[PDB]
Amino acid sequence: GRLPACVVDCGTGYTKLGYAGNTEPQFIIPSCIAIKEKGVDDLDFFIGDEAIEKPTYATKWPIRHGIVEDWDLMERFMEQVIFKYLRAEPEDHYFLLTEPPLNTPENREYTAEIMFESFNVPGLYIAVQAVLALAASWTSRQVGERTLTGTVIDSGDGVTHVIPVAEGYVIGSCIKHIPIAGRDITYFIQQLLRDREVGIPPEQSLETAKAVKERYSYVCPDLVKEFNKYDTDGSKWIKQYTGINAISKKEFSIDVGYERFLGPEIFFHPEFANPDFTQPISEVVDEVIQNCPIDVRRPLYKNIVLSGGSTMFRDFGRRLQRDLKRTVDARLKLSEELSGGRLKPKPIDVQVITHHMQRYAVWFGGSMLASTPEFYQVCHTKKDYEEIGPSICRHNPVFGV
Amino acid sequence: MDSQGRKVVVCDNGTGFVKCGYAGSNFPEHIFPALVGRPIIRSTTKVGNIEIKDLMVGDEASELRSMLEVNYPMENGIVRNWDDMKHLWDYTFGPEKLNIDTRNCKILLTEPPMNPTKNREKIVEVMFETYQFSGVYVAIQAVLTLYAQGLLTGVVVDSGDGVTHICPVYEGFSLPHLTRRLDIAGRDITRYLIKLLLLRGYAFNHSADFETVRMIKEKLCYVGYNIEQEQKLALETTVLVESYTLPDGRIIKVGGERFEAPEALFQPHLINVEGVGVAELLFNTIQAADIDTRSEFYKHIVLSGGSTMYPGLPSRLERELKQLYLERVLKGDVEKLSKFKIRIEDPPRRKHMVFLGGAVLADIMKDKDNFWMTRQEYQEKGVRVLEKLGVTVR
């Protein structure tokens, strides 16, 4: 009968597939591709979970900071996503893809140049990732009490973004884009352990750092006070992680210490990893909002939506909601002093919510969308491509003209 | 130098660059940026040859910004940090620049229009108490832009680093009800050029790297006569792509970021500014004037400041005005456009006209006593000395 649309959120770490109308994706696979190490030999490849285990194949990660770097592989990564996993005849199903805000236009052009010419799709919509994550939260919210106005923090593996949304419209010229994400946290734990805990095989340092990050890590109120708690009372704060070697099948054990709070700290002290960035995320959010119009500053502080897998850290919003309320209650205090102290202005109600769906938040906002009829109007079309060309998909809301 | 030998000094005290010199000067003595830099330790940089003071200022800071945390005291014509602004004035009056004695000199200053009053009162409070200047005057940036051009009638366009203001004059009669300010200038462009370079992967987050992008702007960026023709060049060719080498040796490449950044003076919505550009604002300022004065404004449009030095700005400005004259005055009569007389004074010395005009008004009024504002007057009256200028303060 009438067929639903295909939805694909190709992220740095993990890739989210499925068809519209559904609540959770049909597949969630790493954004990896295993190749051998002319003719039909370019088809000897595997992607996803079928790529890690392959011994005689080389695993490649074609996506960095949300952008694609090798379109020779991503054109092979997408022809298994369609013909193996989804099993879709692309000439029938429309498509919804996702980009980060700072995706170059030439990457949007080569995307559409691939889908429309190679795969011959009849439609395509390249949406912004974190914007779809806000529509998902509104379903958790009461019906009718939907807050169209909200701020979004979407941090995954590649890059972190702060995107305000006011009355449904995206304030694109105030977006910020922090390059710190779950890959920088992982390589920082992968560093601390190489210095202290030798005995981790080099092939299993990454596997060991994600495991520490996902399980043991957390967020601290103050940094230097945690170092003392780990030193003065070490039995309570130092955990232990037993792994398994893949060659000898013998166990290896380590002690998990300062890397429990030091990884996530780079959200707030990003000069730990990247010296080209110093501002915390608690301050990036204040500049995003204070650069927005004066009327939608209060509703944006009151709905700050954490999305992405690298916001699952324990006590992430509790500190962000606290670093802001310090910053917001002072600014109002200073104005009250310069004016003359005659009016005590109303305080601002900061609120940082962390909604139930994070591993497939962006996909869900793409499935709700694609299941509408409005999607089939804004979708660029095969006809429009033949006439106007691949520059039909050149523009994004982050810029004008 | 006046009759009494007292040197007469002219300091612009701009938002991005200081222009200091003496009266009658046809150039300025020193032109240096208005920044103050304190030392800092960074892991990437290693230097132990040059001594780094605790307070570096001006050219010796911007040159050594790699080892510094620079900070601009002034923003959008307004002074934020006085303790960093006095350290700049000292450098401006010291052995490194204009080694003068303040107690035996006269000074002429400038403030932009429709600024707060406490920013003017607090400057005069500083020149008579801290430096104890003998004679002070606070001029209008527009009127000075005419003295250098040798005029009495002309709508001024003065765009700098923080402020872009428009002030019409007619035979020396101020019309402050027509003064307008656009909130866009060379600093709001320099930010937009970083937000564009960020798409290529170049990150300039630090305070020192803000100057590095200014130099990238002053060198490469320009204005497009017909923005459609420029977009064809960037889509069809790759000749606009230039290269800039940074202090750390890293090379970058800059293309369509050259005409897109300063287009925010004419399409200001690209930086989240609601309103109209410098052309549709200059045409609407004139159309507010008395109908008999409009004919002499089009003939005497005067540019100034260093944000008017984008290659192609006056030609672009002449174009957009004639499109509006055709569309709103003439209602679409191309045949009458030949009679439309417009002349945009774009002299290449328009970078310093607010200073040159201050050299001209000083040399004309150096030897008069009813013009300046004396230390004795400030001791007696206080900030009410400004009533000589007509500025109502108490």
Binding site: S335, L338 | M74, E75, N76, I78, R80, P116, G162, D183
Partner: peptide
């Protein structure tokens, strides 16, 4: 500035 804009 004090109200509106920074300066």
């Amino acid at each position: 500035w004090x109200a509106x804009c920074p300066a």
